[PDB]
Write a protein that binds this ligand. Sequence first.
Ligand SMILES: *[C@@H]1O[C@H](CO)[C@@H](O[C@@H]2O[C@H](CO)[C@@H](O)[C@H](O)[C@H]2NC(C)=O)[C@H](O)[C@H]1NC(C)=O
Ligand SMILES: *[C@@H]1O[C@H](CO)[C@@H](O)[C@H](O)[C@H]1NC(C)=O
Ligand SMILES: *[C@@H]1O[C@H](CO)[C@@H](O)[C@H](O)[C@H]1NC(C)=O
Lengths: 189, 179, 13
Amino acid sequence: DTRPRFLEQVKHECHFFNGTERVRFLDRYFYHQEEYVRFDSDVGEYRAVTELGRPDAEYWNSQKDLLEQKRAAVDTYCRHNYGVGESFTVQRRVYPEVTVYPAKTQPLQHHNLLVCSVNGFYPGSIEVRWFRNGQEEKTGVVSTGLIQNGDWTFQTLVMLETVPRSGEVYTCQVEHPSLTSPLTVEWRA
Amino acid sequence: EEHVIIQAEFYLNPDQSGEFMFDFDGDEIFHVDMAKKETVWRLEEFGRFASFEAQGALANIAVDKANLEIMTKRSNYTPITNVPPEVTVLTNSPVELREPNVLICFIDKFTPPVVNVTWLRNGKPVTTGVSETVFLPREDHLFRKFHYLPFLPSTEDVYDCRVEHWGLDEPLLKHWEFD
Amino acid sequence: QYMRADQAAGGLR
Ligand SMILES: *[C@@H]1O[C@H](CO)[C@@H](O[C@@H]2O[C@H](CO)[C@@H](O)[C@H](O)[C@H]2NC(C)=O)[C@H](O)[C@H]1NC(C)=O
Ligand SMILES: *[C@@H]1O[C@H](CO)[C@@H](O)[C@H](O)[C@H]1NC(C)=O
Ligand SMILES: *[C@@H]1O[C@H](CO)[C@@H](O)[C@H](O)[C@H]1NC(C)=O
């Protein structure tokens, strides 16, 4: 289809600091990709982001009932929804499954790449480390980054560029809020 | 901060498409199906603890529909610029022969939120067992999308995620095959 | 245990 498209977006945002101690509420309006007016609980009124949203800022700021609704959103909307979903969102904990397998950087005879597959964890914050016989190797570590599977689980590959020796023991260490002690998986040649 | 909940909505002309969803730290809590007027929880366990009245969402899309007409006039009918997507194909877990797995097609950084996605195995459209997500919001206000295909790893099967978008001249094919 | 939606503000005109 060649016909031009026209897109409108609205985003009601709730930003939480230390639980529900400090809460920030944003009411943002977008034409295509461009925000043109927003309400911010730090201000208490609508403010035009671009000249396109100035009529809506003055029009909405003249409606005190509307403004009183937006000023109460941190209590009736943000803290409320946080309380409804905190059991399966804020407190969701899934520990990862850790798999180690060798690979090749280039078509070589021997393997020169140790992959540490860390799959299915939540939340996303995680720290993965490589050790060669109990000594951490910070050189030659390449990662795929934090991959979002889109189903409330994350995954990441952390690869070590190394030439394995006989009797060498590598171990991949994983730290995650779902764990109380570091998860380790070892690999030897 | 430490947690962000976003109620994201959009309306699109002339497609007359509307969406309403909740985002938590980048994951979808639920969305409302406009046709059935139902709350759809991303994980079915979510519906056992929380509920949502789906008509409040349609009332918002009705206002977003009216605001879009106002903003289109205000911008002198300035249309949107197509931003083509980045496409990545990957598996849910490390691949083992004849051990079940899931193919994930990640479509990212694109607008408008219209896309045609096709899973191909050996160059043929596959429909069995596929699933997808609604259009998910980005902080740069583009969109992201997920498509899934459970499969059994075999050395004789190759796959492709074919993505069409008005910002693309040719359909984007992202390949996957077993080592 | 219902999640509250926030109202969209109707623009001018
Ligand atoms: C998704 O596929 C549909 C169906 O092929 C596309 O819709 C058609 O586009 C042509 C012009 O290219 C029009 O003449 C038709 O009227 C459209 N509708 C139908 C039902 O055929 C649609 O453009 C594709 N979308 C993307 C993003 O590629
Ligand atoms: C975190 O919340 C507790 C609640 O009692 C509060 O005492 C504490 O000061 C908060 N943290 C900070 C840094 O304010
Ligand atoms: C639309 O056109 C009018 C009339 O020329 C002009 O005053 C206004 O600034 C234009 N706005 C945009 C967004 O182009």
